[PDB]
């Protein structure tokens, strides 16, 4: 509780300069100490990338064994997040390296989960989670606590994709009470926001707006809320100030295209949707792609196709969008239920 005392001081007494103060104090610290090891978490759980990358360098080449470990493991995690490497090579590098610390045993498991979630590839997550135990960490109480929040958040997403919405919110809410890290707060609110998309427009917007407030300041955290607010509004067919028209990202384009649909410009929506079709996209994105086509043409093939991609993606929340459409075209309700489950 050296590091912890330092962070708690800055957080309370100098709040709106936290990053300036904690940068200096982190970069000064000796790699070998617990504080430096504790600091690495602070840096990464906050997504302060440059600072995390700097701390990695110092710690990768260091006398203490634990610090050497942390350096090497976060080295992988940050190569994975920047997308220098794929999931498969990350899994090999954890298998190759021999993990001695109980903490880095726990953190190694969570490494791929981040990539899965980003890539829409939801199938592997559930199984990977069950093995982890948080009492295997009983050494460094700061690293123990942030990992609690990390797991509460990851599960909040896992149950979201499993279409266990009451549970998703439970876990996000847990995460919120457990932390005052912005990023964890940001993603808690994102996931509660997402959990209500179909349930209740109002509560979705509340949770997405409340997170949006916390996110302002950060270019990257804003973008998630803006994208989800676009989606929310386009799906409920409401006024939509959230759209970014100057983005090539398939998910921003997808938001444009969803907007024209709501404004009934189906020729222009069709043209642009065909331009996305062969572009690089994860399967979950194709889930939406064909759902969009289904709205334009009203062809069952599109909706059938959209279901197939969500099925591949194992996205049990968003599979219901094409399934509802298919029900309204007089498809056998029982067969559609079999798909939903």
């Amino acid at each position: 509780s050296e590091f912890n005392s330092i962070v708690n001081i800055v957080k309370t007494h100098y709040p709106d300069q936290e990053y300036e103060l904690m940068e200096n104090y982190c970069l000064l610290l000796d790699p070998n100490t617990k504080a430096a090891r504790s600091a690495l978490e602070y840096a990464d759980a906050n997504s302060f990338n440059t600072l995390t990358d700097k701390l990695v360098e110092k710690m990768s080449i260091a006398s203490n064994l634990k610090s050497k470990e942390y350096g090497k493991i976060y080295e992988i995690h940050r190569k994975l997040s920047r997308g220098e490497i794929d999931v498969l090579e990350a899994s090999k590098n954890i298998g190759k390296y021999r993990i001695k610390t109980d903490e880095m045993n726990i953190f190694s498991k969570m490494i791929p989960m981040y990539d899965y979630l980003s890539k829409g590839n939801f199938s592997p997550m559930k199984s990977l989670l069950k093995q982890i135990d948080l009492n295997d960490i009983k050494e460094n109480n700061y690293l123990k606590k942030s990992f609690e929040t990390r797991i509460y958040v990851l599960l909040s997403n896992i149950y979201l994709n499993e279409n266990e919405l009451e549970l998703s919110r439970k876990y996000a809410e847990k995460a919120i009470k457990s932390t005052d890290t912005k990023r964890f707060l940001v993603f808690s609110y994102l996931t509660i926001g997402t959990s209500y998309i179909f349930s209740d427009y109002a509560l979705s917007k509340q949770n997405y707006l409340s997170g949006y407030e916390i996110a302002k300041g950060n270019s990257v955290f804003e973008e998630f809320f803006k994208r989800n607010l676009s989606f929310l509004n386009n799906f409920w067919n409401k006024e939509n100030p959230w759209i970014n028209y100057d983005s090539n990202a398939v998910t921003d384009v997808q938001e444009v295209i969803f907007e024209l649909i709501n404004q009934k410009k189906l020729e222009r929506a069709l043209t642009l949707l065909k331009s996305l079709e062969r572009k690089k996209q994860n399967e979950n994105d194709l889930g939406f792609h064909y759902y969009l086509e289904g709205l334009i043409t009203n062809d069952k093939e599109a909706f059938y196709k959209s279901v197939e991609y969500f099925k591949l993606s194992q996205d049990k929340l968003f599979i219901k969008m094409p399934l509802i459409k298919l029900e309204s075209l007089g498809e056998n309700p029982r067969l559609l239920k079999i798909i939903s489950m």
Binding site: M113, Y114, L117, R150, V153, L154, N157, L160, N161, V186, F187, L190, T191, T194, I197, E223, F224, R227, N228, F231, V250, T251, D252, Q254, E255, D285, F288, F318
Partner: peptide, 6 residues
Amino acid sequence: GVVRGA
């Protein structure tokens, strides 16, 4: 598209 972060 709907994004999810963790």
